[PDB]
Amino acid sequence: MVQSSVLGFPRIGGQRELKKITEAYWSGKATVEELLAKGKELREHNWKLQQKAGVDIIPSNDFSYYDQVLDLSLLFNAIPERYTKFDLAPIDVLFAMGRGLQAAAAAVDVTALEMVKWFDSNYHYVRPTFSHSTEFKLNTAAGIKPVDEFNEAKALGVQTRPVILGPVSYLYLGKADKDSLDLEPISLLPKILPVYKELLQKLKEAGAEQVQIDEPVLVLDLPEAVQSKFKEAYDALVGADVPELILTTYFGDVRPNLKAIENLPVAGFHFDFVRVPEQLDEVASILKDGQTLSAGVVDGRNIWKTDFAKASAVVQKAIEKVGKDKVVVATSSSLLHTPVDLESETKLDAVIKDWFSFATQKLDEVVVIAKNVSGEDVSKQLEANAASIKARSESSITNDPKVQERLTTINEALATRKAAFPERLTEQKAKYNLPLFPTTTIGSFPQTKDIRINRNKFAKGQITAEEYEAFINKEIETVVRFQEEIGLDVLVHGEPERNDMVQYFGEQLNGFAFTTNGWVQSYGSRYVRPPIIVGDVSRPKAMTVKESVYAQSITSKPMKGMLTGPVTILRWSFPRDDVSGKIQALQLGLALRDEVNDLEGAGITVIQVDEPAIREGLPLRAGKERSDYLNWAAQSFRVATSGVENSTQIHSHFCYPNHIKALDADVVSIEFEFSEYPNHIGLGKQEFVSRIEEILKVYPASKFWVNPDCWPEVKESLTNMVEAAKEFR
Numbered sequence: 001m002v003q004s005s006v007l008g009f010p011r012i013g014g015q016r017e018l019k020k021i022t023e024a025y026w027s028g029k030a031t032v033e034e035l036l037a038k039g040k041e042l043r044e045h046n047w048k049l050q051q052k053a054g055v056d057i058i059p060s061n062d063f064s065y066y067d068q069v070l071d072l073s074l075l076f077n078a079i080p081e082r083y084t085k086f087d088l089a090p091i092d093v094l095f096a097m098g099r100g101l102q103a104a105a106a107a108v109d110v111t112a113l114e115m116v117k118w119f120d121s122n123y124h125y126v127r128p129t130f131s132h133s134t135e136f137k138l139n140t141a142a143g144i145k146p147v148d149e150f151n152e153a154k155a156l157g158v159q160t161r162p163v164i165l166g167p168v169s170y171l172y173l174g175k176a177d178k179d180s181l182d183l184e185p186i187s188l189l190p191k192i193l194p195v196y197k198e199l200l201q202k203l204k205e206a207g208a209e210q211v212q213i214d215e216p217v218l219v220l221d222l223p224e225a226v227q228s229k230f231k232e233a234y235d236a237l238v239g240a241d242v243p244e245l246i247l248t249t250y251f252g253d254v255r256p257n258l259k260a261i262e263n264l265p266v267a268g269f270h271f272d273f274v275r276v277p278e279q280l281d282e283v284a285s286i287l288k289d290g291q292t293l294s295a296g297v298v299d300g301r302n303i304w305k306t307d308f309a310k311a312s313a314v315v316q317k318a319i320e321k322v323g324k325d326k327v328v329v330a331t332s333s334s335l336l337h338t339p340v341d342l343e344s345e346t347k348l349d350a351v352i353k354d355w356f357s358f359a360t361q362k363l364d365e366v367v368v369i370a371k372n373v374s375g376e377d378v379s380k381q382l383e384a385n386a387a388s389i390k391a392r393s394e395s396s397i398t399n400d401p402k403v404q405e406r407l408t409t410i411n412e413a414l415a416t417r418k419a420a421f422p423e424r425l426t427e428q429k430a431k432y433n434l435p436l437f438p439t440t441t442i443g444s445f446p447q448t449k450d451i452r453i454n455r456n457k458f459a460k461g462q463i464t465a466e467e468y469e470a471f472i473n474k475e476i477e478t479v480v481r482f483q484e485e486i487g488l489d490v491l492v493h494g495e496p497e498r499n500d501m502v503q504y505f506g507e508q509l510n511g512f513a514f515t516t517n518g519w520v521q522s523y524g525s526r527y528v529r530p531p532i533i534v535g536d537v538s539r540p541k542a543m544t545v546k547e548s549v550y551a552q553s554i555t556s557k558p559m560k561g562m563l564t565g566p567v568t569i570l571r572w573s574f575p576r577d578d579v580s581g582k583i584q585a586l587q588l589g590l591a592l593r594d595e596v597n598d599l600e601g602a603g604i605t606v607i608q609v610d611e612p613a614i615r616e617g618l619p620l621r622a623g624k625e626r627s628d629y630l631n632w633a634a635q636s637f638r639v640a641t642s643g644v645e646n647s648t649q650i651h652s653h654f655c656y657p658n659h660i661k662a663l664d665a666d667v668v669s670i671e672f673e674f675s676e677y678p679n680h681i682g683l684g685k686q687e688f689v690s691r692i693e694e695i696l697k698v699y700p701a702s703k704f705w706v707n708p709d710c711w712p713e714v715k716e717s718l719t720n721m722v723e724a725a726k727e728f729r
Contacts, residue, residue: 001374005057008334053363060160070126090142124523128174200242219252227260250333268292274332284321296332329370344517400536415638427646440490446711493551511537539591565611589639608651634662685720
């Protein structure tokens with residue numbers, strides 16, 4: 001009776017097949033034919049998996065060799081002229097856009113299109129780019145992806161629902177190209193509607209009866225002039241000659257945009273009741289006679305096992321309002337942002353595994369929930385599920401009384417430096433006596449061939465800690481000696497002991513679990529395997545002190561300790577879903593406070609704390625949630641960094657402003673306003689010298705450090721920088 005639905009399935013493969021075959025193709029090791037054979041195999045496997053689980057509404061076109069938004073750009077001929085001058089087949093035009101193109105001499109080095117954050121997910125899309133000259137149209141000669149894949153699935157005996165990003169969202173998330181600065185993308189709506197129409201017309205003839213059309217911009221703050229465009233677009237698209245359209249939203253709250261969609265001729269809507277279950281009543285209220293409501297109640301972005309009782313109760317609210325006949329049980333968003341299969345995990349204890357569901361398992365969840373609300377007896381599954389949920393919430397690996405107690409101690413003084421910056425500056429001039437325009441590295445340096453080899457061997461115990469530790473210290477002695485020669489003032493250690501910004505800390509923190517196979521696509525063939533926060537976080541012992549202490553001992557110049565901030569660790573992990581993001585951040589703040597304190601205590605008194613994920617976690621609409629976030633994000637950072645003496649310098653580096661103000665960092669390295677920065681900033685060979693003079697027309701030279709942008713040309717690059725910083729001294 002009540003149907004289940006999946007908005008998208010991760011395409012990388014249980015064994016990361018997609019990464020393997022696409023990188024083989026790019027490196028000339030595989031043929032386009034072999035590339036295509038593997039894609040087909042991947043799609044077929046994932047379709048049969050969903051059919052076998054019992055899912056009624058199974059997506060097609062959710063597959064991609066790189067990015068789904070990029071696929072549409074290829075499909076609609078939104079292809080900048082520069083990619084078309086190389087005799088590349090359509091699929092290679094596609095990759096040229098996704099990952100750039102290099103060609104021998106002229107001597108072309110064509111940059112890939114811009115990579116962008118997909119809302120507040122940890123996915124990145126390829127920016128649709130337009131010009132006044134853009135001629136929107138379909139290219140049947142390149143094959144029509146959505147039509148071909150729908151047909152592929154049909155031939156397998158699997159009816160699917162094609163998925164495509166809608167016209168308003170597509171344009172609105174695009175940008176004007178270099179030669180059309182004045183162009184506002186949404187203004188192209190009249191040119192692209194006909195092409196969507198033709199595409200839908202072609203999908204109907206193929207025999208597609210419904211199409212999932214994604215309009216996620218509805219969860220953003222939309223200007224009134226953009227809100228009006230939904231009525232326009234959909235009046236144009238809907239008709240007898242096209243599939244029924246399910247207008248689909250996720251990751252947030254559509255209520256502010258409600259009037260924009262309350263009179264559309266579409267056949268249904270999908271809403272995210274995982275992120276905003278509280279919008280249910282109002283969105284249900286505008287549903288027309290003969291519009292269906294797809295209730296997103298299985299998290300598409302996190303790995304926790306769904307509470308079947310609670311998720312069924314949400315769906316039952318929709319039914320009570322609109323009728324069992326008009327409600328569908330759905331994943332909150334595409335499962336793109338979830339790992340493929342929990343069953344691939346070899347190391348997780350069975351107790352903890354019992355708390356998770358990855359994409360494969362979420363298939364079974366939407367099915368059980370749908371059966372449950374239809375009245376089918378699934379008492380067995382509901383009981384097992386209830387047992388699992390009860391078991392998690394009663395665990396201890398989750399609740400650490402010492403951490404709880406410490407949270408109660410958080411207050412203003414705990415999040416505040418012992419003195420305001422002006423007083424701190426004086427104690428720091430007295431201790432460090434750095435010259436004007438001090439120079440400093442911002443991050444790590446190129447990795448040695450042997451670093452990788454020796455690490456793998458130390459992991460197999462093939463070498464002793466002392467052998468490995470001596471290998472690291474050599475890598476450090478190298479990096480340290482280099483910098484001294486270039487004549488930098490404040491050094492880094494090169495971080496050779498580190499593999500990544502977040503797992504390096506997570507592994508050394510309580511409250512974390514890690515997967516062996518929990519891969520999620522981040523961008524193109526680049527995947528991430530995020531740590532899972534499973535409980536109260538604390539930090540048993542020093543995490544980075546030993547290497548920093550060693551690096552500092554071989555030089556008389558100040559050595560920077562190097563850390564990742566609480567919010568970035570939280571944002572780049574799978575978070576707990578039983579406690580607030582804020583509480584996890586503050587626990588991380590306290591754990592990092594001990595680390596900062598241990599560094600200082602060991603004589604490392606210049607400490608850089610980086611928070612690259614601030615903007616990525618910014619709540620999607622202005623308002624209370626956003627302003628709280630900014631407050632607690634900054635508060636978390638200050639809790640980690642405010643235990644130090646006035647003479648200890650807190651640095652923080654950003655890759656390119658309200659949040660930054662509230663951090664009270666002694667030095668903010670910025671990638672290049674100048675307003676709410678009352679302390680010191682850092683900046684990243686001719687116009688390099690001319691740039692400092694230009695900047696020294698507005699702000700005093702007393703305020704400026706100098707630093708890298710963000711491999712063996714690092715000798716000259718740094719040398720040139722340094723030599724130029726002295727030309728001002």
